[PDB]
Amino acid sequence: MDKFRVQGPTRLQGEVTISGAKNAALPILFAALLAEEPVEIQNVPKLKDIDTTMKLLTQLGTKVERXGSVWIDASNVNNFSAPYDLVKTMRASIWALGPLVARFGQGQVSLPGGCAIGARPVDLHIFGLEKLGAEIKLEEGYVKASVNGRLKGAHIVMDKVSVGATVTIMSAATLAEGTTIIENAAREPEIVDTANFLVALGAKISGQGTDRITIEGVERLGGGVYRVLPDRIETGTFLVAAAISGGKIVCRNAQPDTLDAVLAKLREAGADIETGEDWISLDMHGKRPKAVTVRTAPHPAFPTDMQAQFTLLNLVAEGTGVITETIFENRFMHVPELIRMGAHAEIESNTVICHGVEKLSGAQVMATDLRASASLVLAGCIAEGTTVVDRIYHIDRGYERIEDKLRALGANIERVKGE
């Protein structure tokens, strides 16, 4: 069981190159199923889900190969079933459904736990496709979709805002007969990225990033080259790394506009921030951060995915600061770990009351959540002495070589093999 052994305190400073967003790479890889011509997807991170997706794609008849890019040739897709063995470890698997039925008139995806259980978590996907005129069958442990001829454009109103369902509907709609409108579409930068990809292939889409996406169906999608946008949350994690350690950092291969709220919040903490077309710089001028008030909310507001990171910030800042989860529930389970590190905080309802301390103390800690976990690693970096963060595999699933990146920033870090 891999562990991160950290020796603190160390100031985090210098430069880091932000990886492509896993969450944009995924829906794009699936949307590639629509492409009749070869496609090159650039800036794709080397992460478990990407490997799983590649294997899934190959099984369908797609020719796949990777390095920094992933090369895809779906001209020959001829198997329209995503099997149990290939989908099991991954929710994103459902994204194969829409493109298959949209392009091929048929497709199916295995539902772990069977139909009764597995159909529930993907109801919005099913709803969307139905709206598009597909016949959905729940049988033999699968969710099946078929349509005679092309899908049919539709006016679709979402009762729940969903990144997953928005991608399914938008992707499928690009091949539909007519106009499709998605009301209450997810606003995520990842959605914007997937829409842009689609358009690069020849799709007609507008409104991506807003509450309303309008798609005009076309007969076929071609091929081309497309670069996946930067990981906004990874970016935020590094900015915070410097912000809590008195450091200066420059984030390369970044996209400032996906981070409005985070940058604003960092400014409130006293950070000196500068931005360019593809970079972001943060300078604490050797100063401690100032406590901030944080309210997580739907994009483009403050991201819940940045919560743990800012909670940590508050824990070592000058003053008291409160972080409120306005939508999410039971998001503070990692706080007790920080307290064990010498932090002062109270969990109240949907909030955490942070009383900043000058310095943390090394300890043996662990969190199940990916974000909470990386936060523990940052904490170790600035704490006094030795910290051991257990179960880092969680981090490995969403961070591309965080140890290398941290070390290049001055961290004293070591990956330990089963303690």
Ligand X SMILES: O=c1ccn([C@@H]2O[C@H](COP(=O)(O)OP(=O)(O)O[C@H]3O[C@H](CO)[C@@H](O)[C@H](O)[C@H]3O)[C@@H](O)[C@H]2O)c(=O)[nH]1
Q: Can you list the positions of beta strands (E) in 207-305?
A: 212-216, 224-227, 248-252, 272-275, 280-283, 294-296
* For ligand X, the closer CB: 120 or 359: 120
Closer residue to ligand X (CB): 165 or 292: 165
Q: Is 283 known as a binding-site position?
A: no
CA angle (168, 170, 175) in 5-degree steps: 100
What DSSP designation does 244 have?
T
Does 304 interact with ligand X (rule: CB under 6 A)? yes
Q: Is 282 known as a binding-site position?
A: no
Q: Residues 45-84 vs ligand X: string with x where CB under 6 A?
A: ----------------------------------------
123 scored as a contact of ligand X (CB under 6 A) = yes
Window 314 to 373, contacts with ligand X (CB under 6 A):
none
32 binds ligand X (CB under 6 A): no
For residue 85, what are the contacts with CB-CB under 8 A and spacing of at least 6? none
- Least separation in angstroms between residue 269's CB and ligand X is 22
| 122 is an interface residue for ligand X by CB under 6 A | yes
Is 163 labelled a binding residue? yes
Q: What single DSSP character describes residue 31?
A: H
Residue tagged 């919005």 (tokens):
124
CB 5 within 8 A of CB 388: yes
Is 185 or 354 the residue whose CB approaches ligand X more closely? 185
Q: Least separation, in Å, of the C-beta of 168 and ligand X? A: 8
- Name which position in 13, 19, 23, 375 contacts ligand X (CB under 6 A): 23
Per CB under 6 A, 184 contacts ligand X: no
CB 386 within 8 A of CB 9: no
State the DSSP code for 384: B
Question: Is 115 among the catalytic positions?
Answer: yes
> Could you tell me how many residues of this chain bind ligand X (CB under 6 A)?
13
Whichever of 186 and 402 has its CB closer to ligand X, that residue is 186
Assign residue 344 a region: left if phi > 0, alpha if psi is -120 to 50, beta otherwise? Answer: beta
The active-site residue, picked from 115, 251, 354, 381, is 115
Rounded Cα distance between 35 and 224, Å, is: 9
| Catalytic residue ranges | 115
